[PDB]
């Protein structure tokens, strides 16, 4: 955190140079009661790289001012003292990586781009004020006029209240018209890309659901089941934000996928009265094999007397347990609990009727994987007997 | 439907405030013969949330006007009485969800965005009329001039007939030039996204078919078969709008996929003289196993004397039945009917020649799935004997 | 082809109305020596639909002019005689389908959109000329001025040389500023979509290859093999335009896929001295089982003395045949010919060394499919013995 | 490299014509002390095609000037001497292919498009200067004014300081307004496509990882494992730039995939004390079967006493070797080395505990492939005994 404070100090240093250097090139009446901050900030820029694509620090290192002021270089040649301002590309690419995951990275790119567009419109406005006719005017009313002019130019508005006069003004205006049109086109392109990728789980997710509403409106379905389907999609949004568990953690390797599934279902694979005291690898295998299913409120998951193969573990929702006639209530289950256990070791029919109560988010276990990783574990085969 | 009328009442209330508040900030000669609608609408905004991301109703609740009018707050400080207008973000996000599936959701987003762009251009025009030089002018000719100015600014047109005069006008014009350029760029980006996703089944579908026309034009094929292929693609558009049945209902879970297939093929799985009186689960299994195939008009589906494995159920088109010499016509089948039934229980060759008549949309049944879910059903094994 | 001439006649009729109706609404001095073409074109529009989403022909049918001219309807009410011009939407959707595959359909959409944008800018310019102050001016210099104005407006340029004067001009200018901004945004969105999907096999294909050049540049590979790989990608472009045979004809049904593969490899499955005299279905099965492989110039496909399983059929390139010591040349094969035939019936090792000569595009046959569809064909088992 | 110098000479020749021909059409006072470069450059254009979609060289070949100057052709008919400038399309499509892989091809398309947009804005400006009123003005102040005008037009800015005057100027301005709007829309579309495809491995890769951060932020995971996962994604970026080895070289054919894998893992498949002296084909088979796995720093790959099946070859990272009690350190392995060798020939349990040390990038070998291609190699079965 002392290099985070160092990055903050370096950003303040390069900001100071970005605000000062074009202001003392236009106004050479400055820089004289402000050289000490030039010395301190230059030492900061030359001492940052030991505490950290290479020529920005080297070009920022050399004293490109003080030469203008001791040798009185003319107007088109003094301007190379802005070479220190190439360092801002390096500080940009560093600040775009030092804090790239506390917040969204696209909002980071948009704020860095808006910063660069204002800070280059500043330099272009500074160039315009440099090649202006000399006249008495407050350097504020000449910042407001230069900035007003270069926004009239950058925003493709065009009042025409201030126009080029000399040919070398007309050439400077032509060239900054091309760069202004390029930069403003870049601004429109980056904003349309930043707002194109601004909603991802809710956009694609919505599209998916939508792809199913204009269809279920195509089949002319009754509105009760269609609203129930829509409330299903509302549930899976308002629980996992549209994302599928097995397609988020399919872009991971096997050890990392194992660690993520154990961390996600840690006190879940422990919710059970069944996997406690089991082996560590066994738990991983189980997780590497947990399958989620979702029952809406009131759905029949299991009817007592069916064939039945697989065991069910409740994770999030509730459920109720009914007898074979679905008249006598055995119990009512909730998250963390489990049913279908009398189907794995035995080819018996269902012993209780299982109606959903709310949306469930419940895990199921297939028979082949369970009896494969149960034959080799004796202690859970006794935990289940 | 009394909360749909409540949402309509709340939208009318927030619209009234959105039209009134900036009109009484600019013209303080109003609000005096119109306070009663302020009281009624404020009670509506403070009583809506009990009949329903939280600070909009709280900021809308407090009397931010009446303070301007009793204490005569100055021009840059009275303007905080527009804080009630942050409620419109909440009403926007509520009205974008209460009626999101009667119509397309993208047309909904486009209408909400156009509404927000006009209603913010209204506020910016109101700000311009606020910081204008005071002069005698009808408040209509000052709405037409303020709205004409702020559309000249928002539409990057730029006549230059009305320009800033004071420096604080030039700063206000600069800042609303940046916001106008941002909002107009946002308008172009959202319109290009709304018309990019405006045609989906006909765009992607067309592309797919196209990907096959520039290819079949690449192989230099005769036009008769290529037109027949194109009329095939015309048929599958003009029947199911390009969508594949099994990739629309593959984004559903198993119980929902079962319910949708039973609802789609309900009086289809009943069209048969074969699945009536069958089991409920059996029907589901059958559906969970129905496979669609499409024969164009005149195609040979079955020639009598072939080997033959699988049974065919007609769903939509017609077909004709010919004898083994394809000389003596047995019958002619239509939708709902079926052929190939003398191939599942027996390894006999075809008993009739089956020529298509129109485009068919016909269902077929593989042998392994059929004999697997037929061995365990005795009554359909007698229905088929 | 007499309905193609009818569509051409109808397009000429609706074009004539689209050029005439707004020209006689602005200039009522016309229409009097030109009623006969109105009668003929109206009969054409009312007789087209018998030789062919329904209300365009009905609204085009009724005499909405002649009422303006006999009853002298005022300026805001006469304008409903433009209702005939809604027919152009129907003619657009008909002409966008009658010739949708002689040329690309996207170039068709772009030309129809540019046509609609000019033809609506014509109507808006006509509206501007309608609500102009009456003054003496040639109707050409008033078309050039109205069209110049409405392009200055539609192209977000904004000279400001002609501006609204009356309030009802300012409202008309405001409303056509909103529509002009909407239409010009639509133009930018459709052009960016038309040029986004303009290159498909060469864009995606290039990307695929590229995804392999920045990688093979990542592994720091020697340039000879990388250039050979790139010339491989150049070959598969400059032969089949990037498209994979089995992913173009995987979006087809089985009978259509069989017909396309037989048509593609017709005198290919006949190139052989092996499938001639074979069964018709057998040929289809063979095709339904032909597998393409591509050997670059000089590659070793088979070395004599290897194990060898599968037979190879040359389709496009050349190859050479060497002895087991790769010293004595047996022969040299070309397209249409075949090797590896002494590996299917027998588990013998290679009998000749097969070096590629150019890029090959050669077909191979696996052993299980070949011996499965060879056991049931006796005549080819003798053709191969 | 003498045809690379020939392409450079031809580009210089066609550039000279592209700068000269519209300059001598506007100013006919030129061309007289500059005919020799016309003769030399015309000979270069007519002699290029022997040292190299056909009509550009033929249209460039004929003397379309000298006719203007000997017969004094009038203003709308002399202009066909610009027909030589169609050759630039051929030189464009040639220069877009002669150096398409030293640098990115998209940067090439962007530079060619910017070149074509400036070089056509030059011709349109030349047309404007052609149809101007004749007046005394330096041909520089008339290039700055014509170029300033045609950028005011091309950039949708619109000062309105110079406007059409005659009707044939208004028609020329209208037509170049349509082309300017089309070209500027094309510029915005190509820039948004060039910056849309500008980041591919880092964009898609980032998205993939992101698709896993907003999810692992969804499961509310502890930050230590999530940061470790993120540093995993940082490692696989900062090693292979996001690309998967087996999906880069899956778009290759089998001989090319074999050559690339042997070139990538050449002194890798030789790093081993195991595949040296093995067969050439065997090595290829091994490579055609090498599988990469990645262990983070500190992960347990193998615990001594586990079952164990497969052998591991270290490629990049480090690892350490521990005894069965994980108390006594056997050794510590690094890249190029290998473990798990006492699991292939034997069904013994692990003999040493293998903890990762850094991120590994290590290769593993499954048992079935290894014992399949080991049964048929006797010498490596002795190298491993």
Q: Could you say which DSSP state residue A317 is in?
A: S
| Helix B105-130, helix B141-154: angle, nearest 10 | 120
Q: State how far the Cα of D300 lies from the Cα of B33, in Å rounded to an integer.
A: 80
- Extract the tokens encoding C44: 């054409």
Q: State how far the Cα of A294 lies from the Cα of B252, in Å rounded to an integer.
A: 11
Torsion of the alpha carbons at D96, D97, D100 and D101, rounded to the nearest 10: -170
Residue in D353, D273, D368, D258 with CA at minimum distance from that of residue D313: D273
Q: State how far the Cα of C315 lies from the Cα of B43, in Å rounded to an integer.
A: 83
Q: State how far the Cα of C253 lies from the Cα of B293, in Å rounded to an integer.
A: 8
- Extract the tokens encoding A359: 């949306």
Which method was used? cryo-EM
- The residues, ordered by sequence, that sit 6+ positions from D108 with a Cβ below 8 Å of its Cβ are D96, D99, D100
Longest dimension (CA), chain C: 103
Which residues on D lie below 8 Å from B159 (Cβ)? Answer: 160
A136 CB neighbour count, 10 Å cutoff: 5
Helix (H) or strand (E) holding C339: strand C338-339
Place of tokens 């001497």: D81
Q: Are C70 and C31 in contact (CB under 8 A)?
A: no
- The residues, ordered by sequence, that sit 6+ positions from A119 with a Cβ below 8 Å of its Cβ are A18, A88
A103 by Cβ neighbours in 10 Å (0-12 / 13-18 / 19+) ranks as exposed
C114: left (phi over 0), alpha (psi -120 to 50) or beta: alpha
Q: State how far the Cα of A211 lies from the Cα of A124, in Å rounded to an integer.
A: 49
SS3 content of chain D, % helix, strand, coil (to 5): 60, 10, 35
- Extract the tokens encoding D258: 């074999």
Residue in A290, A317, A299, A300 with CA at minimum distance from that of residue A352: A300
Binding-face residues of A in 193-232 toward B, CB within 8 A: 195-196, 206-208, 210-219, 221, 225, 229-230, 232
Place of tokens 């079955």: B302
Cα C236 to Cα C276, C337, C359, D93, D253: the distances in Å are: 30, 21, 9, 20, 11
CB–CB contact B256 A230 (8 Å):
no
Cα C340 to Cα C313, C337, C346: the distances in Å are: 8, 11, 11
Binding-face residues of A in 98-157 toward D, CB within 8 A: 101, 105, 156-157
Strand order, beta sheet including B329-333? B300-302, B353-356, B319-322, B329-333
- The residues, ordered by sequence, that sit 6+ positions from C253 with a Cβ below 8 Å of its Cβ are B293, B294
Cα B251 from chain centroid (whole Å): 17
Q: State how far the Cα of A52 lies from the Cα of B220, in Å rounded to an integer.
A: 63
- The residues, ordered by sequence, that sit 6+ positions from C30 with a Cβ below 8 Å of its Cβ are C20, C23, C24
**Residue D292 phi, psi (nearest 5):** -85, 140
Cα C355 to Cα B217, C24, C272, C366, D261: the distances in Å are: 34, 78, 21, 20, 21
Q: Are C323 and C353 in contact (CB under 8 A)?
A: yes
Cα C95 to Cα B224, B307, C14, C105, C183: the distances in Å are: 22, 47, 12, 11, 22
Cα D328 to Cα D304, D343, D351, D352: the distances in Å are: 12, 21, 12, 10
Strand order, beta sheet including A300-302? A300-302, A353-356, A319-322, A329-333
Helix (H) or strand (E) holding D143: helix D141-154
Can you give the resolution of this entry in Å? 6.7
Place of tokens 């290479």: A54
D74 by Cβ neighbours in 10 Å (0-12 / 13-18 / 19+) ranks as exposed
Q: State how far the Cα of C260 lies from the Cα of B222, in Å rounded to an integer.
A: 11
Residues facing residue C333 across a β-bridge: C319
Q: State how far the Cα of A163 lies from the Cα of A165, in Å rounded to an integer.
A: 6
Where are the extended beta strands (E) located within chain D?
A: 291-293, 300-302, 311-314, 319-322, 329-333, 338-339, 353-356, 362-365
Residues facing residue D312 across a β-bridge: D339, D364
CA atoms lying within 13 Å on the CB side of residue C170: 16
Three-state helix/strand/coil letters over B28-66: CCCCHHHHHHHHHHHHHHHHHHHHCCCHHHHHHHCCCCC
Q: State how far the Cα of B321 lies from the Cα of B302, in Å rounded to an integer.
A: 9
C155 to chain B: closest CA residue: B157
Q: Could you say which DSSP state residue D33 is in?
A: G
- Name the 3-class secondary structure at D300: strand
Cα A133 from chain centroid (whole Å): 48
Burial C110-142 (b: 16+ CB within 10 A, else e): beebeeebebbbbbbbbbbbbebeeeeeeeeeb
Which residues on A lie below 8 Å from D293 (Cβ)? Answer: 253-254
CB–CB contact C177 B157 (8 Å):
yes
Q: State how far the Cα of B118 lies from the Cα of B112, in Å rounded to an integer.
A: 10
Which residues on A lie below 8 Å from B158 (Cβ)? Answer: 156-159
| DSSP-derived pairing of the beta strands C338-339 and C291-293 | unpaired
| Helix D167-194, helix C167-194: angle, nearest 10 | 50
- The residues, ordered by sequence, that sit 6+ positions from A337 with a Cβ below 8 Å of its Cβ are A313, A314, A319
Q: Are C97 and B230 in contact (CB under 8 A)?
A: no
Q: Could you say which DSSP state residue A82 is in?
A: G
Cα C199 to Cα A25, A361, B211, C207: the distances in Å are: 49, 45, 12, 11
Q: State how far the Cα of B225 lies from the Cα of C99, in Å rounded to an integer.
A: 17
- For residue A123, the distance in angstroms to the closest alpha carbon of chain B comes to 17
The set of chains that have 3 or more CB pairs under 8 A with B is A, C, D
Q: Could you say which DSSP state residue B350 is in?
A: P
CB–CB contact A211 B251 (8 Å):
yes
What DSSP assignment string belongs to C181-226? HHHHHHHHHHHHHHTTSS-SHHHHHHHHHHHHHHHHTTTT--HHHH
What DSSP assignment string belongs to A172-216? HHHHHHHHHHHHHHHHHHHHHHHTTSS-SHHHHHHHHHHHHHHHH
Q: Are A107 and A100 in contact (CB under 8 A)?
A: no
**Residue D124 phi, psi (nearest 5):** -70, -35
- Name the 3-class secondary structure at A333: strand
| Residues found in chain D | 385
Q: State how far the Cα of A45 lies from the Cα of A15, in Å rounded to an integer.
A: 11
- The residues, ordered by sequence, that sit 6+ positions from B147 with a Cβ below 8 Å of its Cβ are B121, B122, B125, C174
What DSSP assignment string belongs to C274-299? SSTTS-HHHHHHHHTT-EEE---TT-
Angle at B34 between CA B29 and CA B39, to 5 degrees: 130
Angle at A22 between CA A21 and CA A26, to 5 degrees: 120
Q: State how far the Cα of B351 lies from the Cα of B343, in Å rounded to an integer.
A: 9
Residue in C42, C52, C51, C54 with CA at minimum distance from that of residue C13: C42
Q: Most B CBs within 10 Å: which of C97, C99, C101, as the mutation test of the B interface?
A: C101
Q: State how far the Cα of C31 lies from the Cα of A250, in Å rounded to an integer.
A: 72
Cα A77 from chain centroid (whole Å): 44
Q: State how far the Cα of A369 lies from the Cα of A230, in Å rounded to an integer.
A: 33
Where are the extended beta strands (E) located within chain A?
A: 291-293, 300-302, 311-314, 319-322, 329-333, 338-339, 353-356, 362-365
- Extract the tokens encoding B73: 């707050």
Q: State how far the Cα of D69 lies from the Cα of D35, in Å rounded to an integer.
A: 11
**Residue C276 phi, psi (nearest 5):** -85, 130
Which residues on C lie below 8 Å from B303 (Cβ)? Answer: none
Nearest to A260 among D141, D191, D216 (CB): D216
Query: Which residue stretches of chain C are H helix?
Result: 4-26, 35-51, 55-61, 67-71, 75-78, 87-98, 105-130, 141-154, 167-194, 201-216, 223-240, 245-248, 254-264, 266-269, 280-287, 367-375, 378-383
Q: Are A37 and A71 in contact (CB under 8 A)?
A: no
Q: Are A345 and A375 in contact (CB under 8 A)?
A: no
Q: State how far the Cα of B159 lies from the Cα of D160, in Å rounded to an integer.
A: 8
Q: Are A128 and A149 in contact (CB under 8 A)?
A: yes
Q: State how far the Cα of B358 lies from the Cα of B312, in Å rounded to an integer.
A: 16
Q: State how far the Cα of B341 lies from the Cα of D135, in Å rounded to an integer.
A: 94
Helix (H) or strand (E) holding A109: helix A105-130
Helix (H) or strand (E) holding C320: strand C319-322
Nearest to D159 among A158, A181, A255 (CB): A158
A222 to chain B: closest CA residue: B263
Torsion of the alpha carbons at A243, A245, A250 and A252, rounded to the nearest 10: 100
Q: State how far the Cα of D287 lies from the Cα of D260, in Å rounded to an integer.
A: 10
Place of tokens 């990762």: D356
What DSSP assignment string belongs to D311-354? EEEE-SS-EEEE-TTS-SEEEEE-TT-EE-GGGTS--PPPSSEE
Q: State how far the Cα of D168 lies from the Cα of B157, in Å rounded to an integer.
A: 25
- The residues, ordered by sequence, that sit 6+ positions from D223 with a Cβ below 8 Å of its Cβ are none
What sign has the CA pseudo-torsion C70, C75, C80, C85?
positive
Query: Which residue stretches of chain B are H helix?
Result: 4-26, 35-51, 55-61, 67-71, 75-78, 87-98, 105-130, 141-154, 167-194, 201-216, 223-240, 245-248, 254-264, 266-269, 280-287, 367-375, 378-383
- For residue B190, the distance in angstroms to the closest alpha carbon of chain D comes to 15
- Extract the tokens encoding D171: 């028609």
Q: State how far the Cα of D189 lies from the Cα of D196, in Å rounded to an integer.
A: 10
Q: Are B187 and C181 in contact (CB under 8 A)?
A: yes
Place of tokens 């012993």: A351
- For residue B230, the distance in angstroms to the closest alpha carbon of chain C comes to 9
- Name the 3-class secondary structure at A10: helix
- Name the 3-class secondary structure at C136: coil
Cα A35 from chain centroid (whole Å): 42
Q: State how far the Cα of C85 lies from the Cα of C16, in Å rounded to an integer.
A: 11
């Amino acid at each position: 955190t002392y290099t985070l404070v160092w990055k903050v100090w370096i950003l303040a240093v390069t900001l100071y140079y970005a605000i000062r250097i074009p202001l003392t090139l236009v106004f050479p009446s400055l820089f004289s009661p402000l050289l000490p901050l030039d010395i301190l900030a230059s030492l900061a820029l030359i001492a940052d790289i030991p505490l950290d694509s290479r020529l920005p620090d080297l070009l920022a290192a050399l004293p490109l001012d003080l030469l203008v002021f001791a040798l009185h270089l003319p107007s088109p040649l003094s301007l190379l003292s802005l070479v220190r301002l190439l360092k801002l590309i390096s500080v940009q690419r560093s600040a775009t990586r030092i804090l790239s995951y506390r917040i969204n990275p696209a909002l980071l790119r948009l704020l860095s781009l808006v910063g660069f567009i204002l800070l280059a419109a500043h330099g272009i406005a500074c160039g315009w004020m440099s090649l202006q006719p000399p006249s008495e005017n407050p350097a504020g009313t000449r910042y407001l006029s230069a900035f007003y002019w270069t926004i009239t130019t950058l925003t493709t508005i065009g009042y025409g209240d201030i126009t080029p006069s000399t040919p070398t003004q007309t050439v400077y205006t032509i060239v900054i018209e091309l760069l202004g049109a390029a930069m403003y086109g870049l601004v429109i392109g980056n904003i349309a890309s930043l707002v194109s990728k601004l909603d991802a789980a809710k956009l694609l997710h919505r599209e998916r659901v939508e792809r199913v509403t204009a269809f279920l409106s195509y089949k002319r379905i009754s509105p009760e089941l269609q609203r129930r389907i829509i409330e299903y999609f509302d549930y899976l949004w308002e629980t996992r934000r549209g994302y599928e568990e097995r397609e988020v953690l399919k872009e991971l390797p096997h050890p990392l996928r194992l660690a993520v599934a154990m961390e996600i279902h840690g006190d879940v694979i422990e919710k059970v009265a069944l996997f406690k005291g089991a082996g560590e690898e066994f738990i991983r295998d189980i997780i590497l094999h947990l399958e989620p299913v979702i029952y809406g409120p009131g759905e029949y998951i299991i009817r007592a007397g069916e064939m039945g193969s697989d065991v069910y573990f409740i994770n999030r929702g509730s459920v109720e347990v009914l007898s074979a006639d679905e008249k006598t209530r055995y119990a009512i289950l909730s998250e963390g609990q489990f049913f279908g256990e009398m189907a794995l070791i035995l080819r018996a029919p269902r012993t209780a009727t299982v109606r959903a109560r709310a949306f469930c988010d419940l895990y199921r276990l297939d028979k082949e994987t369970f009896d494969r990783i149960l034959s080799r574990y004796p202690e859970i085969a006794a935990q289940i007997q």
